[PDB]
């Protein structure tokens, strides 16, 4: 279910950095980190580490359907072991860092950056910290 | 207006540290940091620096009534100047540190800490950062 949500109406894109620390409960579940645009909560960016299969699916949900999946096969995560994820964004991409190592970048599909006012965290993650900072 | 809101349904009290950084605009404005419990969006802790008077007003909005006001003498903020507020909870108090200096403690009036799941930031504060961390 939902583990955390934040709302910043002045827009957390571009230029804001989101740092999430925690660990998973099980070895075979999953969690996701979504950036939602206002109003109507389309998903500007969806970040979904899958531990049962050890891949990272990244996608967007605009206007009623997912787009093309962007997948990363090397899993920097490890079940029940603390991790750090940093998601940042500039004019052109979302930038991803795990345990301080850059893992991927994801080019904007939702072009209305200022509409991205929400953050939510779902399912199998025990949260120890969420930090949101302007860069 | 609402500047920022966060929700942690597992309950962010006690043993969590909230750190807010930003600055205000006017020498005569105010902002508030509220901790809200469910049901009813009750305000277990309301932290309200008023710059027009240079006092910090804390209170609770429980069962749809403001309580007794706990007013703080010292006023560490300076309008237009960046500041840091940290609010930490233990089993007994909300502890307030401004710019790393401890300033006041506030006795829990909402006794069901587990039900405190929402943080709210309102009005004249330009936020540069918000950090929510378990036990410091
Ligand atoms: O693209 C992210 C979403 O994927 C959905 O599952 C996909 C799956 O990745 C794919 O292999 C195939 O099975 O189609 C499924 C549905 O499109 C998830 O269900 C969804 O939660 C997102 O993660
Ligand atoms: O106690 C916190 C609330 O105070 C309200 O204003 C008070 C004010 O402090 C006092 O001087 C008196 O006049 O009663 C007012 C209404 O209770 C604020 O309006 C409210 O936002 C809280 O800050």
Q: Do A131 and B128 touch (CB under 8 A)?
A: no
Q: Where are the beta strands (DSSP E) in A63-115?
A: 65-66, 70-72, 83-89, 93-98, 101-107
Chain A residues near residue B127 by CB distance under 8 angstroms: 8, 134
Q: Where are the beta strands (DSSP E) in chain A?
A: 2-7, 16-23, 31-37, 42-50, 55-62, 65-66, 70-72, 83-89, 93-98, 101-107, 116-123, 126-134
Closest-lying ligand to the alpha carbon of A43?
1
Q: Do A4 and B1 touch (CB under 8 A)?
A: no
Q: Is the dihedral of CA B51, B55, B57, B58 positive or negative?
A: positive
- Which residue ranges form the domains of chain B, and what is each CATH number? 1-136 (2.60.120.200)
Report the C-alpha gap between A19 and A6 in whole angstroms.
13
Interface residue B52 vs chain A (CB under 8 A): no
Tokens, residue A41: 């909560």
Report the C-alpha gap between B81 and B84 in whole angstroms.
10
Phi, psi of B91 (to 5 degrees): -60, -15
Closest-lying ligand to the alpha carbon of A48?
1
Name, in order, each residue with C-beta under 8 angstroms of B111's C-beta and a sequence gap of 6 or more: none
Q: Is A124 helix (H, G, I), strand (E, B) or coil?
A: coil
Residue B110 DSSP symbol: S
Interface residue B39 vs chain A (CB under 8 A): no
Q: Do A5 and B3 touch (CB under 8 A)?
A: no
């Amino acid at each position: 279910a939902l583990r955390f949500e934040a709302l910043y109406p002045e827009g957390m894109c571009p230029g804001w950095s989101v740092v999430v620390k925690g660990k998973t409960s099980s070895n075979t579940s999953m969690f996701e980190i979504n950036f939602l645009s206002h109003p109507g909560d389309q998903i500007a960016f969806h970040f979904n580490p899958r531990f049962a299969s050890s891949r990272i699916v990244c996608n967007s949900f605009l206007a009623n359907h997912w787009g093309k999946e962007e997948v990363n096969k090397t899993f920097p995560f490890e079940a029940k072991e603390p991790f750090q994820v940093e998601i940042y964004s500039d004019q052109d991409y979302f930038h991803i860092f795990i345990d301080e190592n850059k893992i991927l970048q994801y080019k904007h599909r939702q072009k209305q950056l200022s509409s991205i006012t929400k953050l939510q965290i779902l399912n199998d993650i025990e949260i120890s910290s969420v930090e949101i900072t302007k860069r």
